[PDB]
């Protein structure tokens, strides 16, 4: 039963094996018009043949070594798969129909699942060397499946770890449509969604995809703008897409390869290097087998009776025919042909096959060496090596713990899986022969804490095979300090737009999603990067004008004092005696008060300065005018007292019913703030000005009626002149009072006060001073 081509040997215990000597079957359309015939597989697999030789070498070495299973020999029964489920099921049917003790598993995950479904019925243990699908770790469906290779969850996590380490957020994914790529892509999608990474496209490929599908995938890749692509597939399934992309000449992409095709000879070609240069992928850990290469080099089509594949091996290696293609003898050298059969650098799957073979032998030895009364079966008994059975071997494999030739313990967990380290490689170009050379740049440690597993040597990486600069795989560029992030409808969060912050607000981050606002008494600078303090505007003594306006007030004070001194010294003189001396003294004191009252309008407006800035001039000028109207021909003193008392009443009631107070205003201009004080009540100020103007008008009329008189050196005309200039300077500033609101309101008030005081002093006293 089974195919004609096989490798067979006899022994006390027989082992099974399945290896992919071919890459795939011949593609054709079978119309059911004639009886269907057997399908043939086409291309050859030197790597699979090397795996088969590794298994045979392990079995033969175990037989030769007398320290393991004495007085007992092992045989084998090995078939070919051509990487197809149908071919592997024919061989498996002959395994369960001599009986096999255990089978060394297949390569593909789907083939392994199909074989294990049949193998688990009879409880025949199956140890695989290359199937890493997470679906095979379910022990409810696969009762007797073990493997020497770890599952792909760690690799899928490592891919996301690498992507996060190189700071990318815009990637695409491609997977093969089988039991190996889909769960891996699902796990990677979960991890990437956890790590805040956006995925643009996701596609499925196959070895038997057609022209429309390949062109659609190529157009999707071409139209996409992401530059990093994660591929979870194998070489036979990835070849057509690579061929089409090479034909279309698409460059500038970054490939993240899984372990299946990170070292495949189908893709690593010099012709394709200009599209797949700089690939970063994963590799397992290499082992050491001493005499393996010597065992490999000794194959021969005539000296290998047990091996049936050696004939076609010779045919494919030497392009000949064994008794158009010529006739080749049996005298050639396999060390002069460039084939992957012996052109290897590390052994990984070969070491997996070695370990999978040795595990069964160790379990058999454990069965053989049992001491009665301390076994694992029923009431402490154990099996017998004369008629041992598959379920007993499976139990002992489930309870196995041994150390290998290198010195590491081998143990299978509850799910029958091992644990192992990963390595990271980079594709380069050989300067001598042009071949692709795999250069190690990092590793992945699975015994470390989360977030401490990845190590990357950045300086040893060429990115497209010729570049030393890390690529750019962001959807959009980063925002600046003065801008914030926007929203583009119909796009993921990884893509946005930068919008400048509005006036009065600032931002200081390169990825800010909003604009900040530092607190009051502050404003945002011109480009809204930082917020600066506001400026306070007010006329103070420091203000240049303030110092000029103070120079003037003290000049007036000094002039009044000098006039008073000249008057008091010459009191008895008839010129002074003509006027009332006490009235002159009171008038000069009131002029002193008027010149002093202008010094309250300058400076910081404290709550008391603005309380008395106005009445200090109002009362003084009222007293001046009242004394002036008196000095014209003591009752007059009491009339003066009445005139001052009337103003005192309204001033006191105003200050006691609605005091004026300081005020900081931030409304006229946003960037600057003012300090100006309102009057509280406006009726009081209006009435003050009205009473002052009423007394002024009364004095003006009274001095107008008696204008034409020469008494007192024509005082009654200079009085009218003084009243006229007072009225003119009061009228001239009404628009300034009613319109502006800055520091110019204070300065004009001081100017008017000084003008009125100076005119009132000069017009009255200059004539008498110039003659005394």
Ligand X SMILES: N[C@@H](Cc1c[nH]c2ccccc12)C(=O)O
Q: Which residue ranges are tagged as binding site for phosphate?
A: 47-51, 348-350
Contact 578, 632 (CB under 8 A): no
Annotated binding site for spermine: 200, 202
Query: At closest approach, how far in Å is the CB of 132 from ligand X?
Result: 4
> What CA–CA distance (Å, rounded) separates 559 from 466?
93
Among 15, 69, 205, 241, binds Ca ion (CB under 5 A): 69
Residue 617 binds which of a second copy, ligand X, ligand A1ATP, none (CB < 5-8 A, kind-dependent):
ligand A1ATP
Determine if 614 is a binding residue for ligand A1ATP (CB under 6 A).
Answer: yes
Binding span for a second copy by CB under 8 A among 6-14, 75-83, 239-247, 394-402: 394-402
Determine if 737 is a binding residue for ligand A1ATP (CB under 6 A).
Answer: yes
Residue 352 binds which of ligand X, ligand NAG, ligand A1ATP, none (CB < 5-8 A, kind-dependent):
none
Alpha helix stretches (DSSP H) within 310-389 = 310-318, 349-368
Nearer to ligand X, 127 or 539 (CB): 127
Residue 415 burial class via C-beta count within 10 angstroms: exposed 0-12, middle 13-18, buried 19 and up? middle
Residue 106 binds which of Ca ion, ligand X, ligand A1ATP, none (CB < 5-8 A, kind-dependent):
Ca ion
> What CA–CA distance (Å, rounded) separates 344 from 350?
11
B/e letters for 174-208, b = 16+ CB within 10 Å, e = fewer, are bbbbbbbbbbbbebbbebbeeeebbbbeebbbbbe
> What CA–CA distance (Å, rounded) separates 640 from 667?
45
Query: At closest approach, how far in Å is the CB of 346 from ligand NAG?
Result: 15
Query: At closest approach, how far in Å is the CB of 479 from ligand A1ATP?
Result: 50
Interaction residues for ligand A1ATP, span 687-716 (CB under 6 A): 688-689, 692
Bridge-based pairing of strands 483-485 and 498-500 is antiparallel
Interaction residues for a second copy, span 173-192 (CB under 8 A): 182, 186, 190
CB atoms within 10 A of CB 220: 15
Contact 149, 284 (CB under 8 A): yes
Sign of torsion, CA 487 488 489 491? negative
Residue 616, token pair as written in the block: 């200090």
Bridge-based pairing of strands 7-9 and 13-19 is unpaired
Determine if 394 is a binding residue for a second copy (CB under 8 A).
Answer: yes
Residues of the chain by 3-state class (helix, strand, coil), percent to 5: 40, 15, 45
Query: At closest approach, how far in Å is the CB of 49 from ligand X?
Result: 13
Interaction residues for a second copy, span 291-320 (CB under 8 A): none
Q: How far is C-alpha 205 from the geometric centre of its chain's CA atoms?
A: 32
> For the window 87-126, what string marks contact with a second copy as x by the rule CB under 8 A?
--xx-----------------------x--xx-xx-x---
Among 92, 100, 126, 131, binds ligand X (CB under 6 A): 131
Binding span for ligand A1ATP by CB under 6 A among 215-223, 404-412, 552-560, 749-757: 749-757
Query: At closest approach, how far in Å is the CB of 740 from a second copy?
Result: 4
Binding span for a second copy by CB under 8 A among 155-163, 306-314, 372-380, 656-664: 372-380
- Of 312, 293, 317, the closest CA to residue 6 belongs to 312
How far is residue 230 from each of residues 176, 201, 423, 453, measured CA to CA in Å?
A: 12, 11, 17, 20
Residue 117 binds which of ligand NAG, Ca ion, a second copy, none (CB < 5-8 A, kind-dependent):
a second copy
Determine if 237 is a binding residue for ligand A1ATP (CB under 6 A).
Answer: no
Contact 77, 124 (CB under 8 A): no
> What CA–CA distance (Å, rounded) separates 688 from 613?
13
Query: Hey, is 761 helix, strand or coil?
Result: helix
Residue 130 binds which of Ca ion, ligand X, ligand NAG, none (CB < 5-8 A, kind-dependent):
ligand X
Contact 117, 406 (CB under 8 A): no
Residue 378, token pair as written in the block: 């029923």
Determine if 438 is a binding residue for ligand A1ATP (CB under 6 A).
Answer: no
Q: How far is C-alpha 659 from the geometric centre of its chain's CA atoms?
A: 59
Alpha helix stretches (DSSP H) within 467-614 = 544-569, 574-578, 581-596, 609-612
Helices 544-569, 744-769: crossing angle, 10 deg rounding: 20
Q: What is the largest CA-CA distance in the chain?
A: 165
Terminus-to-terminus CA distance in the chain, angstroms?
155
Element at 75 (helix H, strand E): strand 74-80
Among 234, 283, 749, 757, binds ligand A1ATP (CB under 6 A): 749
Binding span for a second copy by CB under 8 A among 44-52, 300-308, 442-450, 490-498: 490-498
Query: At closest approach, how far in Å is the CB of 133 from ligand X?
Result: 5
Supply angle C-alpha 71, 76, 79, rounded to 5.
180
Determine if 279 is a binding residue for ligand X (CB under 6 A).
Answer: no
Contact 171, 435 (CB under 8 A): no
Annotated binding site for Ca(2+): 62, 65, 68-69, 81, 107, 132, 150, 152, 193, 196, 259, 422, 490
Determine if 107 is a binding residue for ligand X (CB under 6 A).
Answer: yes
Beta carbons within 8 Å of 558's beta carbon, 6+ residues apart: none
Nearer to a second copy, 471 or 742 (CB): 742
> What CA–CA distance (Å, rounded) separates 653 from 275?
96
Residue 8 binds which of Ca ion, ligand A1ATP, ligand NAG, none (CB < 5-8 A, kind-dependent):
none
Phi/psi for 337 (5° steps) reads -120, 135
Residue 375, token pair as written in the block: 């076994």
Q: Which residues bind ligand NAG (CB under 6 A)?
A: 167, 169, 401, 409, 411, 421, 443, 445, 447, 472, 474, 478
- In this structure, the chain runs to a length of 772
Among 42, 419, 470, 514, binds a second copy (CB under 8 A): 514
Determine if 728 is a binding residue for ligand A1ATP (CB under 6 A).
Answer: no
Query: At closest approach, how far in Å is the CB of 214 from Ca ion?
Result: 22
Annotated binding site: 47-51, 62, 65, 68-69, 81, 107, 109, 130, 132, 150, 152, 193, 196, 200, 202, 259, 348-350, 422, 490
Nearer to Ca ion, 47 or 768 (CB): 47
Among 256, 553, 753, 754, binds ligand A1ATP (CB under 6 A): 753
Contact 108, 116 (CB under 8 A): no
Query: Hey, is 65 helix, strand or coil?
Result: coil
Determine if 260 is a binding residue for ligand X (CB under 6 A).
Answer: yes
Residue 301, token pair as written in the block: 């089509």
Query: At closest approach, how far in Å is the CB of 393 from a second copy?
Result: 10
Q: Which residue has the tokens 């493997």?
A: 147
How far is residue 18 from each of residues 10, 87, 714, measured CA to CA in Å?
A: 18, 10, 140
Query: At closest approach, how far in Å is the CB of 171 from a second copy?
Result: 15
Residue 131 binds which of ligand A1ATP, ligand X, a second copy, none (CB < 5-8 A, kind-dependent):
ligand X
Quote the strand ranges of 99-185, DSSP E: 100-104, 126-128, 145-147, 170-176
Query: At closest approach, how far in Å is the CB of 616 from ligand A1ATP?
Result: 8
Among 41, 111, 136, 397, binds Ca ion (CB under 5 A): 111
Residue 182 binds which of ligand NAG, ligand X, a second copy, none (CB < 5-8 A, kind-dependent):
a second copy
Chain positions contacting a second copy, by CB under 8 A? 31-36, 85-86, 89-90, 114, 117-118, 120-121, 123, 140-141, 182, 186, 190, 196, 202, 208, 376-378, 389, 391-392, 394-395, 398, 485-493, 496, 499, 502, 513-514, 728, 731-733, 735-736, 738-740, 744, 748
Chain positions contacting ligand A1ATP, by CB under 6 A? 614, 617-618, 621, 688-689, 692, 730, 737-738, 749, 752-753
Chain positions contacting ligand X, by CB under 6 A? 107-109, 130-133, 180, 234, 259-260
Chain positions contacting Ca ion, by CB under 5 A? 20, 47, 69, 81, 83, 106-108, 111, 264-265, 490
């Amino acid at each position: 039963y089974g195919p004609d081509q096989r490798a067979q040997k006899k022994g006390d215990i027989i082992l099974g094996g399945l290896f992919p000597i071919h890459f795939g079957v011949a593609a054709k359309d079978q119309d059911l018009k004639s009886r269907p015939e057997s399908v043939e597989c086409i291309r050859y697999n030197f790597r699979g043949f090397r795996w088969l030789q590794a298994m045979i070498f392990a079995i033969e070495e175990i037989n030769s070594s007398p320290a393991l299973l004495p007085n007992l020999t092992l045989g084998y029964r090995i078939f070919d798969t051509c990487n197809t489920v149908s071919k592997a099921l024919e061989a498996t049917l002959s395994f369960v129909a001599p009986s096999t003790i255990a089978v060394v598993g297949a390569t593909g995950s789907g083939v392994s699942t199909a074989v294990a479904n049949l193998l688990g019925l009879f409880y025949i243990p199956q140890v695989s060397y290359a199937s890493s699908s997470r679906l095979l770790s379910n022990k409810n469906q696969f009762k007797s499946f073990l493997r020497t290779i770890p599952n792909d969850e760690h690799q899928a996590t490592a891919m996301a770890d690498i992507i996060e380490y190189f700071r990318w957020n815009w990637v695409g994914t491609i997977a093969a449509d089988d039991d190996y790529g889909r769960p891996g892509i699902e796990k990677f999608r979960e991890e990437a969604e956890e790590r805040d990474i956006c995925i643009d496209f996701s596609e499925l490929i196959s070895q038997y995809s057609d022209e429309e599908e390949i062109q659609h995938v190529v157009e999707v890749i071409q139209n996409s703008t992401a530059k990093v692509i994660v591929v979870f597939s194998s070489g036979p399934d990835l070849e057509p897409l690579i061929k089409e992309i090479v034909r279309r000449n698409i460059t500038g992409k970054i490939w993240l390869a899984s372990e299946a095709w990170a070292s495949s000879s189908l893709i690593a070609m010099p012709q394709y290097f200009h599209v797949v240069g700089g690939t970063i992928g994963f590799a397992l850990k290499a082992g050491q087998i001493p005499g393996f290469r010597e065992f490999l080099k000794k194959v021969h089509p005539r000296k290998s009776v047990h091996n049936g594949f050696a004939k076609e091996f010779w045919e494919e290696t030497f392009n000949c025919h064994l008794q158009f293609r010529p006739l080749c003898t049996g005298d050639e050298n396999i060390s002069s042909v460039e084939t992957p059969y012996i052109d290897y650098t590390h052994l990984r799957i070969s070491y997996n096959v070695y370990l999978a073979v040795y595990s069964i032998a160790h379990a058999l030895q454990d069965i053989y060496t049992c001491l009665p009364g301390r076994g694992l079966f029923t009431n402490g008994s154990c099996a017998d090596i004369k008629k041992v059975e598959a379920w007993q071997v499976l139990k002992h494999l489930r309870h196995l713990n041994f150390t290998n030739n290198m010195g590491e313990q081998v143990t299978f967990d509850e799910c029958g899986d091992l644990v192992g380290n990963y390595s990271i490689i980079n594709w380069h170009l050989s300067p001598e022969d042009g071949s692709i050379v795999f250069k190690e740049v990092g590793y992945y440690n699975v015994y470390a804490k989360k977030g401490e597993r990845l190590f990357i040597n950045e300086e040893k990486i060429l990115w497209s095979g010729f570049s030393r600069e890390v690529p750019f795989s962001n959807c959009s560029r980063d925002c600046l300090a003065g801008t914030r992030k926007g929203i583009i409808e119909g796009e993921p969060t990884c893509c946005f737009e930068c919008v400048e912050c509005p006036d009065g607000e600032y931002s200081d981050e390169t990825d800010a999603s909003a604009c900040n606002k530092c607190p009051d008494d502050f404003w945002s600078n011109e480009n809204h990067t930082s917020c600066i303090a506001k400026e306070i505007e007010f006329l103070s003594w420091t203000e240049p004008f303030g110092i000029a306006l103070t120079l003037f007030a003290v000049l007036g004070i000094f002039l009044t004092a000098f006039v008073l001194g000249v008057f008091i010294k010459f009191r008895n003189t008839p010129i002074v005696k003509a006027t009332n001396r006490e009235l002159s003294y009171l008038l000069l004191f009131s002029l002193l008060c008027c010149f002093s009252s202008s010094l309250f309008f300058i400076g910081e407006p404290q709550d008391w300065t603005c309380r008395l800035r106005q009445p200090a001039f109002g009362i003084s000028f009222v007293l001046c005018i009242s004394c002036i109207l008196v000095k014209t021909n003591n009752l007059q003193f009491l009339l003066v007292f009445l005139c001052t008392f009337m103003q005192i009443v309204i001033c006191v009631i105003w200050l006691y019913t609605a005091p004026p107070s300081s005020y900081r205003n931030q409304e006229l201009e946003d960037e600057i703030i003012f300090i100006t004080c309102h009057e509280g009540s406006l009726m009081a100020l209006g009435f003050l000005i009205g009473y002052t103007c009423l007394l002024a008008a009364i004095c003006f009329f009274f001095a107008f009626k008696s204008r034409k008189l020469p008494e007192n050196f024509n005082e009654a005309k200079f009085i009218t002149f003084s009243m006229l200039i007072f009225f003119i300077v009061w009228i001239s500033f009404i628009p300034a009072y009613a319109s502006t609101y800055g520091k110019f309101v204070s300065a004009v008030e001081v100017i008017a006060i000084l003008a009125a005081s100076f005119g009132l002093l000069a017009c009255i006293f200059f004539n008498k001073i110039y003659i005394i």
